[PDB]
């Protein structure tokens, strides 16, 4: 997460004009990346000036301390100065591995001081010899990160719009695509079939939000502007009549000819560049002037290239993250539209919202990975970002030395923050609430938490084997949904305990328990199996 996903390329445009070179320059490109990160076992300052002696879990519990392991980071910073007349001055600095953060360490994990210690040593260290661990020690209390029940990624979930409120919509199909392992950031695409006949595709990720695009527009953004090719991509054949292909063809025609209010200028346009520009203008921030930038060819080129890179990284990333995989992405998107339109025919029923085949359980690692990426962004990158902006304010760009760069990088992560990765990680562990505000933004915490109530070891083990769906914002409204998600489902046997449930109140069926032999798998070697499948003579590739 720190190396591959946390790359920064931010450009600032000053107004400082106290030197001839300062007037000639109105731009600066801040660019840095980390290639070093390691969490080591918890440490404690015995007398505020010691050598950070080991911190044992009972010391953390007794003294209200946090059993957190320090985070050591090393970053490579590239500062590029941009002037007029095409000049480009670059300042490069390499930062020694520095530490301002600590990450909470689950008891019993390989970074816990009692990971491999003998049971007698645990007995005399103040720990439970027989307990397995799996909990966190934060501010004087023990916390368990539960198994958050999440829908399956890379799966098309199709549900009819049976909410009886705002019924201007018909069936909707969402597809959360993940580029790879658990920790890669997922981009969710939503395909909506409308009453007017339109089929709008909405992509929700970092760079996109609540923006609804007609399907043919996304298709012809990548070339293939011919309607024949798009209809062939959806229905897979325009030459076999059938009864299903007739319906899909006619309704795709209706969607194509529907006039949407927002994308009117580029709806009828067959020029790929114009559509790419329009979407880049609409979706990219920091571009307030819609006419000033157009008179500069290089600004247009920058916007187009950035938008194409974005769409490469955001539209179906699991299909690929390179421009050469865009046509197969179009094939996959046509397949998704075909599946939704098949389901419309009542040919297939909607996805079962409670069937466990389309559900995954994310525990500790995944939930903490997501919370950590958000918190690391907010409490590390933005401090560094503002520190470097102020540093450029204070000092001339070529006048910056190697030592000053490191001072501004490390110091920005120190003042007024000093622990905030640890404190925010602790807050995410303690709360686990399905509505939190980070930097004044209403986000959801996907970390299923639970206080460790040690009524008996059976209670502890059952708590660590608990699967929670954990209703988020826009929770269950008064419908059959609040009943069905609490019923024992026919897919439960063998994985979810059919018997275990709360017998009272709102929690009846809300919290599920793993069966006795059920286990949660980790991510496998996807690359090896994919290579074996591609080398299989019986499988014909997309190409």
């Amino acid at each position: 997460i720190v190396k591959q996903m946390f790359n920064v390329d931010i450009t600032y445009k000053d107004q400082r004009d106290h030197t001839e070179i300062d007037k000639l320059r109105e731009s600066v490109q801040i660019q840095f990346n980390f290639t070093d990160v390691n969490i080591e076992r918890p440490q404690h300052r015995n007398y505020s000036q010691g050598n950070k002696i080991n911190l044992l879990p009972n010391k953390a519990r007794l003294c209200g301390l946090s059993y957190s392991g320090p985070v050591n980071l090393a970053a490579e910073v590239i500062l590029t100065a941009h002037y007029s007349n095409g000049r480009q001055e670059v300042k490069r600095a390499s930062i020694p591995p520095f530490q301002v953060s600590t990450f909470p360490i689950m008891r019993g994990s390989n970074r816990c001081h009692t990971h491999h210690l003998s049971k007698t040593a645990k007995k005399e260290i103040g720990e439970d010899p027989n307990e397995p661990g799996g909990y966190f020690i934060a501010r004087g209390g023990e916390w368990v990160v539960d198994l958050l029940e999440n829908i399956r990624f890379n799966t098309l979930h199709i549900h009819y719009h049976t909410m009886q409120q705002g019924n201007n919509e018909i069936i909707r199909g969402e597809f959360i695509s993940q580029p790879g392992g658990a920790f890669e950031n997922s981009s969710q695409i939503i395909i909506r079939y409308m009453t007017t006949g339109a089929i709008t595709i909405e992509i929700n990720s970092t760079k996109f939000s609540k923006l609804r695009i007609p399907w043919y527009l996304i298709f012809r953004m990548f070339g293939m502007t011919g309607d024949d090719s798009i209809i062939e991509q959806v229905v897979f054949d325009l030459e076999s009549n059938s009864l299903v292909n007739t319906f899909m063809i006619e309704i795709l025609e209706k969607s194509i000819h529907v006039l949407d209010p927002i994308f009117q200028p580029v709806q009828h346009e067959l020029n790929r560049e114009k559509i790419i520009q329009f979407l880049s203008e609409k979706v990219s921030k920091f571009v307030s002037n819609p006419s000033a930038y157009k008179s500069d060819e290089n600004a247009v080129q920058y916007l187009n290239e950035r938008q194409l890179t974005i769409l490469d990284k955001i539209l179906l990333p699991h299909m690929g993250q390179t421009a050469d995989t865009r046509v197969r992405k179009l094939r996959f998107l046509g397949l998704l539209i075909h599946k939704i339109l098949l389901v419309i025919m009542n040919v297939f029923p909607p996805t079962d919202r409670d069937s466990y085949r389309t559900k995954r359980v994310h525990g500790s690692g995944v939930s903490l990975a997501k919370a950590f990426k958000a918190i690391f962004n907010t409490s590390v990158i933005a401090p560094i970002i503002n520190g470097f902006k102020e540093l450029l304010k204070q000092t001339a760009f070529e006048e910056l030395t190697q030592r000053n760069i490191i001072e501004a990088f490390s110091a920005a992560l120190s003042k007024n923050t000093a622990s905030d990765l640890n404190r925010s990680m602790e807050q995410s562990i303690i709360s686990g609430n399905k509505t939190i505000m980070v930097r004044q933004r209403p986000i959801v915490n996907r970390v299923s938490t639970q206080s460790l109530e040690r009524k008996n070891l059976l209670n502890t083990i059952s708590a660590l084997r608990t699967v929670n769906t954990h209703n988020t914002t826009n929770a269950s409204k008064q419908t059959e949904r609040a009943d069905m998600m609490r019923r024992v489902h026919a897919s439960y046997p063998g994985y979810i305990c059919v018997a275990q449930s709360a017998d009272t109140g709102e929690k009846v069926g809300m919290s599920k328990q793993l069966a006795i032999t059920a286990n949660v798998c980790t991510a496998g070697e996807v690359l090896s199996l994919k290579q074996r499948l591609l080398s299989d003579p019986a499988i014909q590739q997309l190409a």
């Binding site: 015995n46 007398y47 080991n54 010391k59 003294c63 040593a121 005399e124 260290i125 103040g126």
Partner: peptide, 28 residues
């Protein structure tokens, strides 16, 4: 300073093994 060490668990382990050997008085 003592409150930082006396509540440190390895001191109890170090104390309890000194009591077994008899290097320190059994009580406090």
């Amino acid at each position: 300073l003592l409150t930082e060490i006396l509540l440190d668990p390895m001191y109890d382990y170090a104390a309890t093994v000194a009591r077994i050997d008899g290097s320190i008085p059994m009580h406090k």
